[PDB]
PDB file of all heavy atoms in Angstrom:
ATOM      1  N   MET A 281      17.192   4.240   3.450  1.00  0.00           N
ATOM      2  CA  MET A 281      15.909   4.585   2.853  1.00  0.00           C
ATOM      3  C   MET A 281      14.797   3.664   3.324  1.00  0.00           C
ATOM      4  O   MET A 281      13.622   4.024   3.212  1.00  0.00           O
ATOM      5  CB  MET A 281      16.000   4.531   1.326  1.00  0.00           C
ATOM      6  CG  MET A 281      14.805   5.131   0.602  1.00  0.00           C
ATOM      7  SD  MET A 281      15.079   5.320  -1.162  1.00  0.00           S
ATOM      8  CE  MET A 281      15.084   7.101  -1.315  1.00  0.00           C
ATOM      9  N   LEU A 282      15.145   2.486   3.833  1.00  0.00           N
ATOM     10  CA  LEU A 282      14.188   1.509   4.329  1.00  0.00           C
ATOM     11  C   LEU A 282      14.689   0.985   5.661  1.00  0.00           C
ATOM     12  O   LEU A 282      15.849   0.579   5.772  1.00  0.00           O
ATOM     13  CB  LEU A 282      14.013   0.351   3.341  1.00  0.00           C
ATOM     14  CG  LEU A 282      13.017   0.534   2.198  1.00  0.00           C
ATOM     15  CD1 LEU A 282      13.706   1.134   0.997  1.00  0.00           C
ATOM     16  CD2 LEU A 282      12.385  -0.793   1.833  1.00  0.00           C
ATOM     17  N   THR A 283      13.820   0.996   6.671  1.00  0.00           N
ATOM     18  CA  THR A 283      14.203   0.471   7.978  1.00  0.00           C
ATOM     19  C   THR A 283      14.288  -1.050   7.953  1.00  0.00           C
ATOM     20  O   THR A 283      15.237  -1.638   8.483  1.00  0.00           O
ATOM     21  CB  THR A 283      13.212   0.944   9.041  1.00  0.00           C
ATOM     22  OG1 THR A 283      13.505   2.300   9.396  1.00  0.00           O
ATOM     23  CG2 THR A 283      13.298   0.078  10.286  1.00  0.00           C
ATOM     24  N   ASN A 284      13.317  -1.704   7.319  1.00  0.00           N
ATOM     25  CA  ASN A 284      13.259  -3.160   7.320  1.00  0.00           C
ATOM     26  C   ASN A 284      13.891  -3.773   6.077  1.00  0.00           C
ATOM     27  O   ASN A 284      14.567  -4.802   6.183  1.00  0.00           O
ATOM     28  CB  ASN A 284      11.806  -3.626   7.447  1.00  0.00           C
ATOM     29  CG  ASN A 284      11.682  -5.134   7.543  1.00  0.00           C
ATOM     30  OD1 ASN A 284      10.695  -5.716   7.093  1.00  0.00           O
ATOM     31  ND2 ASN A 284      12.684  -5.775   8.132  1.00  0.00           N
ATOM     32  N   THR A 285      13.644  -3.186   4.903  1.00  0.00           N
ATOM     33  CA  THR A 285      14.237  -3.588   3.627  1.00  0.00           C
ATOM     34  C   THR A 285      13.730  -4.960   3.181  1.00  0.00           C
ATOM     35  O   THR A 285      13.995  -5.396   2.054  1.00  0.00           O
ATOM     36  CB  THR A 285      15.777  -3.533   3.710  1.00  0.00           C
ATOM     37  OG1 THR A 285      16.296  -2.826   2.577  1.00  0.00           O
ATOM     38  CG2 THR A 285      16.411  -4.915   3.761  1.00  0.00           C
ATOM     39  N   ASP A 286      12.941  -5.617   4.033  1.00  0.00           N
ATOM     40  CA  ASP A 286      12.298  -6.889   3.705  1.00  0.00           C
ATOM     41  C   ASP A 286      10.849  -6.594   3.331  1.00  0.00           C
ATOM     42  O   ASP A 286       9.927  -6.735   4.133  1.00  0.00           O
ATOM     43  CB  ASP A 286      12.396  -7.857   4.879  1.00  0.00           C
ATOM     44  CG  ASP A 286      12.148  -9.294   4.474  1.00  0.00           C
ATOM     45  OD1 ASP A 286      11.715  -9.529   3.329  1.00  0.00           O
ATOM     46  OD2 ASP A 286      12.384 -10.190   5.310  1.00  0.00           O
ATOM     47  N   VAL A 287      10.655  -6.178   2.079  1.00  0.00           N
ATOM     48  CA  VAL A 287       9.338  -5.721   1.651  1.00  0.00           C
ATOM     49  C   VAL A 287       8.399  -6.895   1.411  1.00  0.00           C
ATOM     50  O   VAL A 287       7.174  -6.728   1.429  1.00  0.00           O
ATOM     51  CB  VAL A 287       9.463  -4.832   0.401  1.00  0.00           C
ATOM     52  CG1 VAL A 287      10.082  -3.496   0.771  1.00  0.00           C
ATOM     53  CG2 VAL A 287      10.286  -5.524  -0.668  1.00  0.00           C
ATOM     54  N   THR A 288       8.940  -8.093   1.179  1.00  0.00           N
ATOM     55  CA  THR A 288       8.087  -9.266   1.016  1.00  0.00           C
ATOM     56  C   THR A 288       7.408  -9.635   2.329  1.00  0.00           C
ATOM     57  O   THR A 288       6.228 -10.002   2.346  1.00  0.00           O
ATOM     58  CB  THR A 288       8.904 -10.440   0.478  1.00  0.00           C
ATOM     59  OG1 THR A 288       9.242 -10.195  -0.891  1.00  0.00           O
ATOM     60  CG2 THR A 288       8.116 -11.731   0.561  1.00  0.00           C
ATOM     61  N   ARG A 289       8.134  -9.529   3.443  1.00  0.00           N
ATOM     62  CA  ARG A 289       7.539  -9.784   4.750  1.00  0.00           C
ATOM     63  C   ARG A 289       6.391  -8.824   5.027  1.00  0.00           C
ATOM     64  O   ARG A 289       5.386  -9.204   5.636  1.00  0.00           O
ATOM     65  CB  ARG A 289       8.608  -9.673   5.837  1.00  0.00           C
ATOM     66  CG  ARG A 289       8.352 -10.525   7.065  1.00  0.00           C
ATOM     67  CD  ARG A 289       8.844  -9.834   8.327  1.00  0.00           C
ATOM     68  NE  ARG A 289       8.793  -8.381   8.219  1.00  0.00           N
ATOM     69  CZ  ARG A 289       7.806  -7.626   8.683  1.00  0.00           C
ATOM     70  NH1 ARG A 289       6.760  -8.153   9.298  1.00  0.00           N
ATOM     71  NH2 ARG A 289       7.872  -6.305   8.530  1.00  0.00           N
ATOM     72  N   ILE A 290       6.530  -7.569   4.599  1.00  0.00           N
ATOM     73  CA  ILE A 290       5.452  -6.600   4.755  1.00  0.00           C
ATOM     74  C   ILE A 290       4.257  -6.981   3.889  1.00  0.00           C
ATOM     75  O   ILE A 290       3.110  -6.955   4.347  1.00  0.00           O
ATOM     76  CB  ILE A 290       5.961  -5.185   4.426  1.00  0.00           C
ATOM     77  CG1 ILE A 290       7.049  -4.769   5.416  1.00  0.00           C
ATOM     78  CG2 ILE A 290       4.817  -4.187   4.444  1.00  0.00           C
ATOM     79  CD1 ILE A 290       8.113  -3.880   4.818  1.00  0.00           C
ATOM     80  N   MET A 291       4.506  -7.353   2.631  1.00  0.00           N
ATOM     81  CA  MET A 291       3.418  -7.686   1.718  1.00  0.00           C
ATOM     82  C   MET A 291       2.641  -8.909   2.185  1.00  0.00           C
ATOM     83  O   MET A 291       1.448  -9.039   1.884  1.00  0.00           O
ATOM     84  CB  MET A 291       3.973  -7.906   0.311  1.00  0.00           C
ATOM     85  CG  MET A 291       4.256  -6.617  -0.446  1.00  0.00           C
ATOM     86  SD  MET A 291       5.551  -6.765  -1.694  1.00  0.00           S
ATOM     87  CE  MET A 291       4.833  -7.979  -2.792  1.00  0.00           C
ATOM     88  N   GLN A 292       3.293  -9.812   2.913  1.00  0.00           N
ATOM     89  CA  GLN A 292       2.659 -11.012   3.435  1.00  0.00           C
ATOM     90  C   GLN A 292       2.329 -10.903   4.917  1.00  0.00           C
ATOM     91  O   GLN A 292       2.018 -11.917   5.548  1.00  0.00           O
ATOM     92  CB  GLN A 292       3.553 -12.225   3.183  1.00  0.00           C
ATOM     93  CG  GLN A 292       4.127 -12.275   1.783  1.00  0.00           C
ATOM     94  CD  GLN A 292       4.595 -13.656   1.392  1.00  0.00           C
ATOM     95  OE1 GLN A 292       4.832 -14.507   2.246  1.00  0.00           O
ATOM     96  NE2 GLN A 292       4.735 -13.887   0.094  1.00  0.00           N
ATOM     97  N   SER A 293       2.403  -9.705   5.488  1.00  0.00           N
ATOM     98  CA  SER A 293       2.083  -9.522   6.892  1.00  0.00           C
ATOM     99  C   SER A 293       0.573  -9.513   7.098  1.00  0.00           C
ATOM    100  O   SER A 293      -0.203  -9.188   6.198  1.00  0.00           O
ATOM    101  CB  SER A 293       2.696  -8.225   7.417  1.00  0.00           C
ATOM    102  OG  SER A 293       2.165  -7.100   6.745  1.00  0.00           O
ATOM    103  N   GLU A 294       0.158  -9.879   8.312  1.00  0.00           N
ATOM    104  CA  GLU A 294      -1.267  -9.915   8.620  1.00  0.00           C
ATOM    105  C   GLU A 294      -1.871  -8.519   8.660  1.00  0.00           C
ATOM    106  O   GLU A 294      -3.069  -8.360   8.411  1.00  0.00           O
ATOM    107  CB  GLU A 294      -1.503 -10.637   9.947  1.00  0.00           C
ATOM    108  CG  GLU A 294      -1.968 -12.083   9.803  1.00  0.00           C
ATOM    109  CD  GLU A 294      -2.868 -12.310   8.595  1.00  0.00           C
ATOM    110  OE1 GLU A 294      -3.956 -11.699   8.540  1.00  0.00           O
ATOM    111  OE2 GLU A 294      -2.490 -13.102   7.706  1.00  0.00           O
ATOM    112  N   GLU A 295      -1.074  -7.501   8.980  1.00  0.00           N
ATOM    113  CA  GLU A 295      -1.595  -6.140   8.969  1.00  0.00           C
ATOM    114  C   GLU A 295      -1.869  -5.667   7.546  1.00  0.00           C
ATOM    115  O   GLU A 295      -2.859  -4.974   7.289  1.00  0.00           O
ATOM    116  CB  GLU A 295      -0.633  -5.207   9.704  1.00  0.00           C
ATOM    117  CG  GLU A 295      -0.233  -5.750  11.073  1.00  0.00           C
ATOM    118  CD  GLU A 295       1.061  -6.529  11.057  1.00  0.00           C
ATOM    119  OE1 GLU A 295       2.022  -6.067  10.412  1.00  0.00           O
ATOM    120  OE2 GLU A 295       1.120  -7.613  11.670  1.00  0.00           O
ATOM    121  N   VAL A 296      -1.000  -6.036   6.604  1.00  0.00           N
ATOM    122  CA  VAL A 296      -1.257  -5.722   5.201  1.00  0.00           C
ATOM    123  C   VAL A 296      -2.357  -6.615   4.642  1.00  0.00           C
ATOM    124  O   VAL A 296      -3.247  -6.150   3.921  1.00  0.00           O
ATOM    125  CB  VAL A 296       0.045  -5.832   4.388  1.00  0.00           C
ATOM    126  CG1 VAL A 296      -0.256  -5.967   2.906  1.00  0.00           C
ATOM    127  CG2 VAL A 296       0.923  -4.622   4.646  1.00  0.00           C
ATOM    128  N   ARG A 297      -2.323  -7.908   4.974  1.00  0.00           N
ATOM    129  CA  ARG A 297      -3.270  -8.854   4.388  1.00  0.00           C
ATOM    130  C   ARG A 297      -4.702  -8.553   4.808  1.00  0.00           C
ATOM    131  O   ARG A 297      -5.648  -8.853   4.071  1.00  0.00           O
ATOM    132  CB  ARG A 297      -2.894 -10.282   4.776  1.00  0.00           C
ATOM    133  CG  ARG A 297      -1.708 -10.834   4.021  1.00  0.00           C
ATOM    134  CD  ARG A 297      -1.867 -12.311   3.743  1.00  0.00           C
ATOM    135  NE  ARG A 297      -0.925 -12.775   2.733  1.00  0.00           N
ATOM    136  CZ  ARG A 297       0.103 -13.572   2.982  1.00  0.00           C
ATOM    137  NH1 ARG A 297       0.360 -14.006   4.203  1.00  0.00           N
ATOM    138  NH2 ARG A 297       0.893 -13.944   1.980  1.00  0.00           N
ATOM    139  N   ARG A 298      -4.886  -7.967   5.990  1.00  0.00           N
ATOM    140  CA  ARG A 298      -6.229  -7.703   6.489  1.00  0.00           C
ATOM    141  C   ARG A 298      -6.866  -6.467   5.867  1.00  0.00           C
ATOM    142  O   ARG A 298      -8.069  -6.256   6.046  1.00  0.00           O
ATOM    143  CB  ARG A 298      -6.203  -7.573   8.015  1.00  0.00           C
ATOM    144  CG  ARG A 298      -5.925  -6.176   8.531  1.00  0.00           C
ATOM    145  CD  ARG A 298      -6.186  -6.096  10.025  1.00  0.00           C
ATOM    146  NE  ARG A 298      -5.591  -7.213  10.750  1.00  0.00           N
ATOM    147  CZ  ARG A 298      -4.452  -7.153  11.424  1.00  0.00           C
ATOM    148  NH1 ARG A 298      -3.761  -6.030  11.513  1.00  0.00           N
ATOM    149  NH2 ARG A 298      -3.998  -8.246  12.029  1.00  0.00           N
ATOM    150  N   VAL A 299      -6.098  -5.651   5.137  1.00  0.00           N
ATOM    151  CA  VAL A 299      -6.666  -4.516   4.416  1.00  0.00           C
ATOM    152  C   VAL A 299      -6.713  -4.749   2.915  1.00  0.00           C
ATOM    153  O   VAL A 299      -7.228  -3.896   2.179  1.00  0.00           O
ATOM    154  CB  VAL A 299      -5.886  -3.215   4.701  1.00  0.00           C
ATOM    155  CG1 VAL A 299      -5.697  -3.021   6.192  1.00  0.00           C
ATOM    156  CG2 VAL A 299      -4.550  -3.224   3.980  1.00  0.00           C
ATOM    157  N   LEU A 300      -6.194  -5.874   2.435  1.00  0.00           N
ATOM    158  CA  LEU A 300      -6.190  -6.167   1.013  1.00  0.00           C
ATOM    159  C   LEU A 300      -7.604  -6.454   0.521  1.00  0.00           C
ATOM    160  O   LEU A 300      -8.458  -6.952   1.258  1.00  0.00           O
ATOM    161  CB  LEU A 300      -5.286  -7.362   0.719  1.00  0.00           C
ATOM    162  CG  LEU A 300      -3.775  -7.152   0.809  1.00  0.00           C
ATOM    163  CD1 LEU A 300      -3.056  -8.267   0.088  1.00  0.00           C
ATOM    164  CD2 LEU A 300      -3.374  -5.805   0.248  1.00  0.00           C
ATOM    165  N   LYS A 301      -7.842  -6.136  -0.747  1.00  0.00           N
ATOM    166  CA  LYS A 301      -9.149  -6.359  -1.339  1.00  0.00           C
ATOM    167  C   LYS A 301      -9.444  -7.855  -1.426  1.00  0.00           C
ATOM    168  O   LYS A 301      -8.556  -8.655  -1.731  1.00  0.00           O
ATOM    169  CB  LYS A 301      -9.223  -5.726  -2.725  1.00  0.00           C
ATOM    170  CG  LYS A 301      -9.671  -4.277  -2.705  1.00  0.00           C
ATOM    171  CD  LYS A 301     -10.012  -3.773  -4.091  1.00  0.00           C
ATOM    172  CE  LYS A 301      -8.816  -3.828  -5.015  1.00  0.00           C
ATOM    173  NZ  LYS A 301      -8.823  -2.695  -5.976  1.00  0.00           N
ATOM    174  N   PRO A 302     -10.682  -8.258  -1.147  1.00  0.00           N
ATOM    175  CA  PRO A 302     -11.002  -9.688  -1.098  1.00  0.00           C
ATOM    176  C   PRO A 302     -10.837 -10.369  -2.447  1.00  0.00           C
ATOM    177  O   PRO A 302     -11.095  -9.791  -3.504  1.00  0.00           O
ATOM    178  CB  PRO A 302     -12.468  -9.708  -0.650  1.00  0.00           C
ATOM    179  CG  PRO A 302     -12.696  -8.378  -0.016  1.00  0.00           C
ATOM    180  CD  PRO A 302     -11.832  -7.423  -0.766  1.00  0.00           C
ATOM    181  N   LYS A 303     -10.397 -11.624  -2.391  1.00  0.00           N
ATOM    182  CA  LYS A 303     -10.298 -12.441  -3.591  1.00  0.00           C
ATOM    183  C   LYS A 303     -11.686 -12.779  -4.113  1.00  0.00           C
ATOM    184  O   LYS A 303     -12.602 -13.077  -3.343  1.00  0.00           O
ATOM    185  CB  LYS A 303      -9.521 -13.722  -3.297  1.00  0.00           C
ATOM    186  CG  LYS A 303      -8.021 -13.571  -3.418  1.00  0.00           C
ATOM    187  CD  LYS A 303      -7.547 -13.865  -4.827  1.00  0.00           C
ATOM    188  CE  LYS A 303      -6.249 -13.143  -5.130  1.00  0.00           C
ATOM    189  NZ  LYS A 303      -6.378 -11.675  -4.942  1.00  0.00           N
ATOM    190  N   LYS A 304     -11.839 -12.735  -5.431  1.00  0.00           N
ATOM    191  CA  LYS A 304     -13.113 -13.001  -6.075  1.00  0.00           C
ATOM    192  C   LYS A 304     -13.003 -14.248  -6.940  1.00  0.00           C
ATOM    193  O   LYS A 304     -11.937 -14.563  -7.475  1.00  0.00           O
ATOM    194  CB  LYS A 304     -13.564 -11.808  -6.928  1.00  0.00           C
ATOM    195  CG  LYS A 304     -13.794 -10.526  -6.140  1.00  0.00           C
ATOM    196  CD  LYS A 304     -15.215 -10.433  -5.614  1.00  0.00           C
ATOM    197  CE  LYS A 304     -15.265  -9.757  -4.253  1.00  0.00           C
ATOM    198  NZ  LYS A 304     -15.528 -10.729  -3.157  1.00  0.00           N
ATOM    199  N   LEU A 305     -14.116 -14.965  -7.055  1.00  0.00           N
ATOM    200  CA  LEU A 305     -14.195 -16.103  -7.957  1.00  0.00           C
ATOM    201  C   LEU A 305     -14.191 -15.616  -9.398  1.00  0.00           C
ATOM    202  O   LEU A 305     -14.915 -14.681  -9.751  1.00  0.00           O
ATOM    203  CB  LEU A 305     -15.455 -16.915  -7.667  1.00  0.00           C
ATOM    204  CG  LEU A 305     -15.798 -18.070  -8.606  1.00  0.00           C
ATOM    205  CD1 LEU A 305     -15.084 -19.337  -8.180  1.00  0.00           C
ATOM    206  CD2 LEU A 305     -17.294 -18.282  -8.636  1.00  0.00           C
ATOM    207  N   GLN A 306     -13.372 -16.246 -10.229  1.00  0.00           N
ATOM    208  CA  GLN A 306     -13.189 -15.823 -11.606  1.00  0.00           C
ATOM    209  C   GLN A 306     -14.076 -16.641 -12.537  1.00  0.00           C
ATOM    210  O   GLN A 306     -14.648 -17.664 -12.161  1.00  0.00           O
ATOM    211  CB  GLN A 306     -11.719 -15.950 -12.015  1.00  0.00           C
ATOM    212  CG  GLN A 306     -10.783 -14.994 -11.297  1.00  0.00           C
ATOM    213  CD  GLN A 306     -11.327 -13.585 -11.219  1.00  0.00           C
ATOM    214  OE1 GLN A 306     -11.724 -13.003 -12.226  1.00  0.00           O
ATOM    215  NE2 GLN A 306     -11.340 -13.023 -10.019  1.00  0.00           N
ATOM    216  N   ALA A 307     -14.188 -16.164 -13.772  1.00  0.00           N
ATOM    217  CA  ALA A 307     -14.951 -16.878 -14.782  1.00  0.00           C
ATOM    218  C   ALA A 307     -14.292 -18.214 -15.098  1.00  0.00           C
ATOM    219  O   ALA A 307     -13.070 -18.364 -15.024  1.00  0.00           O
ATOM    220  CB  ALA A 307     -15.071 -16.038 -16.053  1.00  0.00           C
ATOM    221  N   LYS A 308     -15.119 -19.196 -15.443  1.00  0.00           N
ATOM    222  CA  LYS A 308     -14.601 -20.504 -15.811  1.00  0.00           C
ATOM    223  C   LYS A 308     -13.725 -20.389 -17.051  1.00  0.00           C
ATOM    224  O   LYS A 308     -14.012 -19.612 -17.964  1.00  0.00           O
ATOM    225  CB  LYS A 308     -15.751 -21.475 -16.074  1.00  0.00           C
ATOM    226  CG  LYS A 308     -16.075 -22.386 -14.918  1.00  0.00           C
ATOM    227  CD  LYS A 308     -17.549 -22.716 -14.886  1.00  0.00           C
ATOM    228  CE  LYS A 308     -17.814 -24.089 -15.458  1.00  0.00           C
ATOM    229  NZ  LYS A 308     -18.956 -24.750 -14.785  1.00  0.00           N
TER     230      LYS A 308
END
């Protein structure tokens, strides 16, 4: 069902990271 099965590597990949929504500064 999964070719790679290492879904953490995908979540931390540069291809995924470059489409992720930007981090925002939070309230104090």
Side-chain angles (χ1 to χ4, degrees):
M281 191 170 247
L282 275 90
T283 282
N284 184 211
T285 229
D286 198 350
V287 289
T288 289
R289 209 214 29 97
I290 297 147
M291 281 153 62
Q292 315 200 340
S293 62
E294 259 326 298
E295 310 95 44
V296 161
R297 284 216 165 110
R298 88 169 47 101
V299 310
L300 287 198
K301 272 192 299 215
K303 274 270 154 303
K304 298 272 145 254
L305 174 86
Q306 293 315 308
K308 261 148 101 147

